[PDB]
Structure formats: C-alpha cells, structure tokens
C-alpha cells in the first residue's frame, strides 16, 4: 500500500531564501524528493509535521481546500508562504473514526482560516504535494503522544488507505538537531550550531542510509535528548509506523543548517 516514504525539513528558510547556497541545496533536495514522490504515483500523501501542534485530542485536517498566505512567526523577515492545500477528506475522516478504536481520541478540523503550520506549507510547495492529484491526510503532532503512539497513528492511517484502495506516499516533516542560534547571524554564514549536533546528525543519517532499524531505534531517544532534535524525532516515528518498522535503506538527498539547527531531506528505500 505504501509506495513511497520521505523525511523533509519543516524550516521555511530553504524555500524563502534559496540564494543562500546551503539553504538552496536543501530546497533543491526537497524538490527532488517531490519528483521521486510523484514517480511512485500515490493517490494520497500521508503527512505528519512537528509544527502542527495538538494538546487535547488528535487532529486530522478535514478541509477539502485550504488556501491563504502564511507568515512564519520567527522567519517573517524572509518572506511569505502562499498555499493552496488539498485534503483527502474521505481518508482523513476515516482516520478520525479509526483513532479511538486504537485508543486515541480524535477530531477533524475544517475551518476557514485554520492555521496550517509552516512545515506542512513549505513541504507542499517544494514537493508539489497537497494538490488535487496528491491530496493530503495530515495528522497532528499531539504534544502528549510518544513515538510509539505516533507509529500507531501512522499504521492506522495506512490501513484506512488500504481499505479505500489508495496508494500512499508517507512524508514526515521536521528538522534534526534543534540548537537554533539565539542571536542574528549573516544567513550566508549559517552552519550547524555545534560540532556535537553535527556528529549526532551524521551518525544517525548513516544509520538511516544503511537501513539499520535496530541500531536506529536505540539511538533515537539519546539523539533526541542530546542534540535537541525537533519534537523528539516523532516525524521519523511516523515514517517507521507507516513502514511497519522495516525499510531496506535510504538516500540522503541533502543535509545542512537552518539557523543553527540541522535539516535533511531523506528518500527511503522500502
């Protein structure tokens, strides 16, 4: 049922200012991830973003068409993010229904002007997803959900897709190390904040390349703590859950900084 799997950055900097070389490389890598996505011919894109935050019940985006212009509350100086995002309402609504049967209270969210997060927006734009051809099923990052529960939501959603006879591309949206600079820098001089974060990023990126799920699994919690990884790396858990804890290897299409934080585009070989 799953035909494709990708991890892409939630940072809007690669989109907003690609003329900063390393940012531009990350944007180019995301674009390429989108082309690979398209070539796998999915009917839906199963999306989780670390920046789409829920605290009460799990939210699933159920608005057929959401359009607007978003200004990131940290990176507003670098420009605006126009969006026209399509949802697979039939599938998202089935995930809402299926969630409590797997022990997670859930609702749909279908409101004009609902604040879709920066990550979902930039992924859609760079990857060319969230269109009428590649509509989204977006599940929220509930701050009280562990990685294990995030995996449960992902698998749960893949099953619903199998019931509706839809091929699924899975996309996890979030960063790597999260040591963002706490002063203004020259964007051209952007780099990973510290060496320890860089080593940790490179170490786990190689585990993913090799398809070493066993070693990756035990590294993840220590990595998340020590490198301040975006939201406990639950966006990878989302990929793992959809893939049922199995993938042969990966191709890191890009790895680079985003205002001190780490970011990567990863194409997964199922």
């Amino acid at each position: 049922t799953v035909v494709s799997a990708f991890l892409v950055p939630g940072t809007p900097l690669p989109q907003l200012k690609p003329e900063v070389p390393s940012w531009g490389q990350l944007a180019a890598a995301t674009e390429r991830a989108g082309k690979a996505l398209a070539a796998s011919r999915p009917d839906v894109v199963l999306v989780y973003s670390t920046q789409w935050l829920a605290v009460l019940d799990q939210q699933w985006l159920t608005r057929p068409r959401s359009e607007g212009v978003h200004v990131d509350e940290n990176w507003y100086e670098f420009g605006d993010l126009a969006y026209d995002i399509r949802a697979d309402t039939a599938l998202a609504e089935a995930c809402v229904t299926s969630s409590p049967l797997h022990g997670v209270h859930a609702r749909g969210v279908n409101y004009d002007g609902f604040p879709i997060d920066t990550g979902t927006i930039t992924a859609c734009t760079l990857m060319g997803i969230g269109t009428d051809a590649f509509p989204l099923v977006v599940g929220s990052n509930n701050l009280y959900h562990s990685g294990e529960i995030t995996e449960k939501l992902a698998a749960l959603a893949v099953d619903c897709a199998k019931d509706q006879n839809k091929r699924v591309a899975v996309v996890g949206v979030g960063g790597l190390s999260g040591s963002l600079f706490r002063e203004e820098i020259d964007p051209r001089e952007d780099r990973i904040a510290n060496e320890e974060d860089d080593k940790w990023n490179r170490r786990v990126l190689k585990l993913i390349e090799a398809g070493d799920v066993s070693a990756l699994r035990e590294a993840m919690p220590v990595y998340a703590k020590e490198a301040r990884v975006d939201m406990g790396f639950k966006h990878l858990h989302w990929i793992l859950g959809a893939l049922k804890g199995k993938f042969s290897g990966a191709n890191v299409l890009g790895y680079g900084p985003s205002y001190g934080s780490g970011a990567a585009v990863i194409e997964f070989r199922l």
Binding site: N74, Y76, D112, G113, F114, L180, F181, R182, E184
Partner: protein, 303 residues
C-alpha cells in the same frame, strides 16, 4: 513630559471568555459561559476605561521566538485569528494599531541592556490568538494603540531561572522605553496560572456544570499565589514562582508576569482580584496593580 506606567494587569487569554460574550468579531456563537471570569473582566474593562492610556503593551506566550525578543513594528495589522486547539470557539476577525515608536524604543533599550531584540516589519504577519484574546477581553473597542511583544524561548530552551532573568531585563528595558518616550502606558501580562487541564473535548463547551479545577493541588497553588499578591507580598510570590511553575505547570513560565513586574519594579503593592475561575481546568485570575493610586506610576522626565 513624563512617562507613566498607569497600571499592570494580569490579563489571561482563555478564548472561551470571548466565545461566551458573542461579540461581532467572533464567528462561532455560544449560549453564554464562564460569566464569573467574564464579569471579572467587566471590572477590568471599566478600570482601564478610566485610565485613558496612550498605549497597551502585551506579552503573549503564543508568539514564541528563539532569536531574542520581538516587537510588532508595522503600524496597521489585521486578520482572522483562528485558535489551533479551540477552533470551534475562537475565529476572530481583528484590526489593530501598533505604537511603532514605543515598540522601537523597547527594542532599542532591550538591545542596549544585552538582550537580542527584533522589529517585526512584515505587514502580512498574523497577530497571535493569545494577544487578540487578551486585548479584546480588556478592551473590546480596539481604540488604543498596542505594542505586541513576543515570548522568547529562554525559559524552556535554557531553564526557568535564565529565562526569567531575560524577562526581568526586558521589563526594565520596557520601563526605560516608556519613560524616554513619555508614554502613558498600561501593561498586560497574558498568563494563566495552573495549566493542568482536561484532555477531553466536552461536546457543548459552555456547560458550566462540567467546568472545574483539573486538580486540587493546582487550585491550591493558584489561591496561595493569588493571596500573596493581594496581600502585597510581591517578593514572596517571586521567591515561590519557580516551585509554582513546576508543580502547577503555570503559564507564567512564559515570562509575561515577570516582564510586567520588572517594568513596575516589583512593587510591594496590594493587587486587586477582579475574579478567579477555571477554563478547561486551568486557573485564571484577572488582577490589577494600580500604580497611579499607589503614587508609583510616574517614571521620570522624558527626552
């Protein structure tokens, strides 16, 4: 010309309080609700109505910045503020005016004091739902220029102490900006107290028979802190603030409460409690430090 901090308000931002009022700006309609807290805000409204300040300064936990402390720097801002967690209760069309001159003064003095500060100059920026809710709650007319301040990450990314220390510096930076400009300002700390909450969405949210403290201990912390404030024991509230943060998951960890009092120079002054109530289990107090009545409002000769 003298600059003045007329007063400081503990003005929390639970959106249910605007939902229950059914103003024209808010799309969804309620059968009322939370009228105790809402009546508390009517008391707050009329006190502010009499002050006739030049500017309202607000510090919101729901504009979160990593790179220092940010200030709204566009003269006119507007939009449709939809709450990400309670979209069924808060979809609010707004249009507000920013006191850019003072906002720039604040940013300036903050930088000079060792903080990193930024001006927000993107005119399509959507002002955060916390800021829009507090402003409506204290001033539904939308007729006073505002200065929106972001809540820098520091209390969470570093630790409570180091973040609080930044908020203190921000506060005395704000006081200095107010006094150099000669503004007659009111401060708005947009923080709720105990933030332990219900995890479940209650069908008909206005049902006040199903509204109550989430925990006993959290409520007990709120009362103890509220008592000290109205007692005028300000040094005792701030000595207890970290333990209160941890045990009650209090939203004052965001920094607004410390920023406010730092700007007022931690006055050993009895605060007025307009009211206390819960919303989804969280403790919210609407309060005031009337510096004008205490004779502590005037800051010094402006430039």
């Amino acid at each position: 010309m003298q600059g003045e901090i007329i007063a400081g308000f503990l003005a929390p931002h639970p959106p249910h309080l605007v939902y229950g009022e059914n103003p024209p700006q808010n799309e969804p309609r309620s059968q009322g609700g939370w009228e105790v807290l809402r009546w508390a805000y009517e008391r707050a409204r009329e006190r502010l109505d009499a002050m006739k300040p030049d500017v309202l300064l607000v510090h919101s936990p729901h504009w979160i910045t990593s790179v220092g402390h940010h200030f709204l720097g566009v003269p006119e801002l507007s939009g449709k503020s939809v709450d990400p967690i309670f979209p069924n209760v808060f979809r609010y069309d707004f249009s507000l005016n920013v006191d850019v001159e003072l906002a720039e003064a604040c940013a300036e003095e903050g930088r000079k004091a060792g903080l990193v500060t930024k001006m927000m100059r993107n005119p399509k920026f959507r002002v955060d739902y916390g800021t829009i809710t507090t402003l409506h709650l204290i001033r539904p007319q939308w007729d006073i220029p505002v200065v929106g301040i972001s809540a820098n990450n520091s209390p969470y990314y570093l630790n409570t102490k180091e973040g609080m220390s930044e908020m203190d510096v921000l506060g005395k930076a704000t006081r200095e900006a107010i006094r150099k400009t000669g503004r007659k300002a009111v401060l708005l700390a947009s923080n709720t107290l105990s933030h332990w909450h219900f995890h479940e969405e209650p069908t008909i949210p206005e049902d006040m028979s199903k509204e109550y403290p989430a925990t006993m201990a959290g409520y007990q912390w709120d009362i103890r802190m509220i008592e000290l404030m109205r007692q005028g024991k300000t040094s005792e509230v701030f000595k207890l603030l970290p333990q209160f943060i941890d045990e009650a998951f209090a939203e004052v960890k965001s920094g607004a409460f410390t920023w406010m009092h730092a700007a007022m120079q931690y006055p050993e002054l009895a605060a007025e409690l307009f009211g206390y109530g819960t919303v989804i289990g969280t403790g919210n107090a609407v309060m005031e430090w009337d510096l004008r009545k205490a004779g502590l409002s005037m800051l010094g000769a402006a430039d």
